[PDB]
């Protein structure tokens, strides 16, 4: 037979530490407690660009604790925003892991981003227009390339078994975890830091996605705007995030006394090849990503107790994902849509949601999907709502189905 | 034992078609004939930005046949440059492959880029400054994200087993081929289109890399400027490119009557974790990427007849790579540095050089490394020079060691 995690064909891989900054909290355990309490990170946008442009969208979730409140002048001048977020989270994660001394040559970093690794280019032009090519800093190259955040974390932590950056829009953070798992199971690494980072809420992303009719404009009730799978959903809401996890072989964790939080069992990556932004309505390739993760894990659909949905709250997105979940045989799973409370953070969100899936398995509880008040007949999923559902969750799939038809599914198990 | 291509642990994977556009020609076979004839694609830059800024660097290789000479108004308004290059090359490759009808669900696309997938953001701002958020096109989102080129090719050709975009600066195109090989050998796909694309030579990249002292300023003799491994080298020269190859299982090629050009045997990805732009002087992690490709291939260093060097012509870059080649045990290999003739094209160059490595194995010939006139005692490599070297090349490694310490080595075999 082909290798699987269950049959021992792949080494056992465990999640041993997690970190995230969100619109609810800089502390992942406090984010988690808040989600369980029904808290939302989504508020009225107070930014002056809203009134300047009279934007249709006037809501979103800025980080509770801004990254740059932790950043000095040097970091502010010599790193992009996503590089600063990466440095911050990388250091926080390493400290949560008990600052372990690992073999640099068996240590990988894989960190996705979505849009915002395209920040520092304009400023370079400006320097050049005023004073010419010699007024462009010799530091420009290290700030402008889209792999900058992963590069910073790899250099910070000393990762010499590969430093990688996948870009697949919304699924970038999940895809990063996927590739880190592959790096380990193929024998290239024993430990990896992986996840995703993304820039802050800004005017142009709001305008670009608003003009696709992708975004909620329920401005009078910000905390009620994001309604994944609900009959009355009207698009997504931006909520800032960055998230990283530490994964390693079970043997590597045991050798250093690390307590695993969960198992990372398999990962499926597929594509729709359907449309440049819209998901395929039939959910067939998305569902196949789910199935692929199960194959690699050595699980059957009936094993899947829980799906952490991509669940953006767009009309067409949630409908496609319901079809996907059915195609994969997982439509009896308990479903959570964290974007209901945390909003959408393109390249970071899949990583954040992967962290949340780990916590669900660890604690045996799924927070309520906020705003889920009227089930949609065309969805027909068991969506957790009202208050947290405590349950015997043994296995879970985290879905991330990004703009462009990039489908990533990650299979996790309780440790 | 652990799986290898030689021991049958991984399926046999073959290269069945190739395409590229370069500073020498739009036709890869004509590029190849030109390289063998000692031709250089590097000339005086005639662009007005040179004189406007009085740039220190006044040389480079624009594509012989500009992409946009093949592009109509619709494509010009609705795709970024790298997306247009991708569409062009994707279609050319598919036609060279005999336009095969493959199973979409076993067909992957992996396409890297370096910088230039960050083109269309400024124009979106401008539209918004003048007429507001509703003047930003609903097409903006599909043009601004760094995965846009891979997305276009996947949609064009119908690839539903994953559409991926690695970013690792100079090694992006090689890394893409690496991940495509993994996608196949792990069982996720049977066929993949892979490689890299990059934008055109522009003022800001020139200024940014010039200010690092990374670039040659031998403006009076443009064709003589790029001197990899030569004692008198003074940095790299930009030469535009994009390149794609079609790879598939040997069984898949045989079933459809495709004639393989070469075997893709293994791929190693490591990282220096040393510095944000400079390579580690000791070449140890770079060499390890080479070694890893051999392990996966099931080859020993003594099997390696040929190394297609990363060879940028920077003082510190070439020195580090010589150390790498020694560390990997491949310092008896015949070495070629195509950047001598084709220049450096960040995200595309590794893919282009992977194509060149395939042709070397197919034809049993290595073109001369241009400008290699005075060996450097600290390099001590067998560098092909003067005229093509005809040889019994059975196995070859293509090196791509990008800014940030991203090391990719690909192991190829003669078919
Ligand atoms: Na999810
Ligand atoms: Na090379």
């Amino acid at each position: 037979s082909q290798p699987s995690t269950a049959n021992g064909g792949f080494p056992s891989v465990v999640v041993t530490a997690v970190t995230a900054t969100t619109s609810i909290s800089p502390d992942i355990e406090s984010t988690w407690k808040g989600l369980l309490a029904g808290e939302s990170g989504i508020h009225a946008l107070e930014d002056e660009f809203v009134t300047k442009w009279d934007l249709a969208v006037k809501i979103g979730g800025h980080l509770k604790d801004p990254v740059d409140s932790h950043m000095g002048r040097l970091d502010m001048r010599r790193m992009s925003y996503v590089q600063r977020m990466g440095k911050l989270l990388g250091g926080q994660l390493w400290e949560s892991a008990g600052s372990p001394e690992v073999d640099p040559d068996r240590f990988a970093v894989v960190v996705g981003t979505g849009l915002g690794g395209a920040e520092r280019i304009v400023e370079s032009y400006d320097l050049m227009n005023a004073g010419g090519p010699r007024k462009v800093s010799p530091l420009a190259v290290q700030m402008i390339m889209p792999n900058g955040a992963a590069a910073v974390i790899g250099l910070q932590l000393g990762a010499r078994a590969g430093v990688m950056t996948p870009v697949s829009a919304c699924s970038s953070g999940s895809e990063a975890i996927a590739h880190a798992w592959r790096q380990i199971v193929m024998g290239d690494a024993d430990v990896a830091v992986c996840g995703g980072v993304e820039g802050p809420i800004e005017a142009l992303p709001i305008a670009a996605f608003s003009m696709m009719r992708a975004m909620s404009t329920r401005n009078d009730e910000p905390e009620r705007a994001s309604r994944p799978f609900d009959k009355d959903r009207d698009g997504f809401v931006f909520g800032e995030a960055g998230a990283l996890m530490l994964i390693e072989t079970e043997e590597h964790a045991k050798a250093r006394g690390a307590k695993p939080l969960a198992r990372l069992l398999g990962a499926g990556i597929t594509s729709d090849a359907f449309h440049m932004v819209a998901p395929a309505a039939d959910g067939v390739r998305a569902g196949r990503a789910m199935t692929r993760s199960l194959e690699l894990a050595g699980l059957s659909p009936a094993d899947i107790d829980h799906v952490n949905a991509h669940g953006t709250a767009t009309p067409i997105g949630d409908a496609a994902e319901a079809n996907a979940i059915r195609v994969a045989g997982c439509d009896q799973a308990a479903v959570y849509a964290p974007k209901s409370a945390l909003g959408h953070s393109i390249g970071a969100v899949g990583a954040l949601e992967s962290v949340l899936t780990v916590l669900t398995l660890r604690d045996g509880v799924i927070p309520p999907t906020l705003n889920y008040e009227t089930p949609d007949p065309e969805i027909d999923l068991d969506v957790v709502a009202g208050e947290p559902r405590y349950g015997d969750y043994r296995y879970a799939v985290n879905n991330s189905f990004g703009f462009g038809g990039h489908n990533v599914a990650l299979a996790f198990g309780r440790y």
Side-chain angles (χ1 to χ4, degrees), chain A:
Chain A
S1 56
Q2 307 279 38
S4 82
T5 297
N7 80 14
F10 298 129
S12 167
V13 176
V14 287
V15 185
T16 53
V18 295
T19 196
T21 190
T22 74
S23 56
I24 292 172
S25 180
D27 307 314
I28 183 60
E29 296 295 337
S30 302
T31 289
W32 185 236
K33 287 177 203 135
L35 292 176
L36 293 168
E39 296 170 10
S40 166
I42 306 312
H43 313 308
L45 284 180
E46 305 203 316
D47 306 73
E48 309 281 308
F49 64 67
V50 178
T51 73
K52 184 185 178 176
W53 301 120
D54 192 24
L55 294 178
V57 168
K58 302 188 164 64
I59 58 175
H62 289 295
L63 291 180
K64 187 64 161 205
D65 179 37
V67 163
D68 287 346
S69 78
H70 298 273
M71 292 290 142
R73 293 178 189 183
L74 283 180
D75 284 347
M76 289 299 305
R77 288 183 178 152
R78 310 187 178 183
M79 270 177 286
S80 72
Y81 177 90
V82 298
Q83 283 178 318
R84 298 194 301 273
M85 170 178 280
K87 171 173 179 173
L88 184 59
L89 298 182
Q92 286 174 183
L93 185 70
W94 209 247
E95 175 187 274
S96 291
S99 299
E101 305 260 43
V102 300
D103 180 353
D105 296 343
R106 304 292 299 161
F107 176 28
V109 166
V110 189
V111 178
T113 186
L115 299 154
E119 196 214 341
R120 284 273 185 155
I121 301 160
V122 163
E123 162 203 316
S124 315
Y125 292 124
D126 287 345
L127 267 19
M128 197 171 170
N129 289 317
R134 297 201 72 89
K135 287 46 178 171
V136 172
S137 160
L139 272 29
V141 166
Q142 74 193 60
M143 292 191 284
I144 70 183
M145 311 218 62
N147 61 320
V152 165
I153 298 161
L155 183 60
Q156 176 188 217
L157 299 179
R160 299 189 173 110
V163 175
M164 296 180 278
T165 304
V167 313
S168 52
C170 321
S171 57
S172 300
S174 288
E175 206 191 319
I177 300 166
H179 287 298
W181 176 83
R182 290 181 184 200
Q183 192 77 348
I184 297 171
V185 303
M186 290 191 84
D188 290 79
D190 298 325
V191 51
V193 166
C194 52
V197 297
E198 187 56 80
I201 289 165
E202 292 187 323
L204 175 60
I206 291 171
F209 285 98
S210 286
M211 281 310 299
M212 303 197 319
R213 213 179 83 169
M215 294 188 78
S216 173
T217 56
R218 190 195 290 247
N219 296 322
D220 66 322
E221 295 187 297
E223 302 80 0
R224 299 190 67 211
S226 188
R227 322 179 60 89
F229 303 113
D230 186 78
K231 197 188 159 168
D232 301 320
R233 67 192 183 274
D234 78 321
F236 75 79
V237 173
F238 278 131
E240 296 172 11
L244 298 179
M245 55 170 60
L246 184 67
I247 71 175
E248 60 198 276
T249 66
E250 189 165 1
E251 171 193 35
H252 188 281
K254 189 169 180 169
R256 74 185 184 80
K259 324 187 208 167
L261 304 150
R263 297 169 189 287
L264 177 53
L265 297 174
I269 302 168
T270 65
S271 46
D272 285 0
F274 167 73
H275 189 277
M276 288 301 291
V277 296
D282 66 24
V284 166
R285 300 312 300 159
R288 171 66 197 162
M290 297 180 78
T291 302
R292 183 52 173 165
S293 74
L294 303 190
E295 291 178 354
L296 294 175
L299 303 169
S300 74
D303 294 326
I304 301 308
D305 297 316
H306 169 56
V307 170
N308 182 304
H310 181 62
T312 62
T314 65
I316 70 172
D318 296 353
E321 178 171 26
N323 276 340
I325 292 165
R326 282 187 272 283
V327 165
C330 296
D331 74 338
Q332 300 301 294
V335 174
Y336 177 44
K339 293 182 182 59
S340 70
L342 292 167
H344 192 187
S345 55
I346 302 188
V349 78
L352 172 60
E353 298 181 352
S354 295
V355 168
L356 297 174
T357 303
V358 164
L359 296 177
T360 290
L361 290 164
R362 189 192 66 189
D363 291 348
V365 65
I366 301 160
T369 309
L370 302 189
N371 305 313
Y372 188 68
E373 285 162 14
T374 314
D376 183 324
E378 292 307 297
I379 300 302
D380 200 30
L381 299 171
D382 179 18
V383 180
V384 176
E387 69 184 15
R389 189 190 295 185
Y390 292 86
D392 187 30
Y393 313 118
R394 306 155 303 165
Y395 306 102
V397 180
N398 178 42
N399 290 340
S400 305
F401 304 145
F403 296 118
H406 305 287
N407 308 311
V408 181
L410 299 170
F412 289 97
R414 185 193 177 187
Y415 179 75

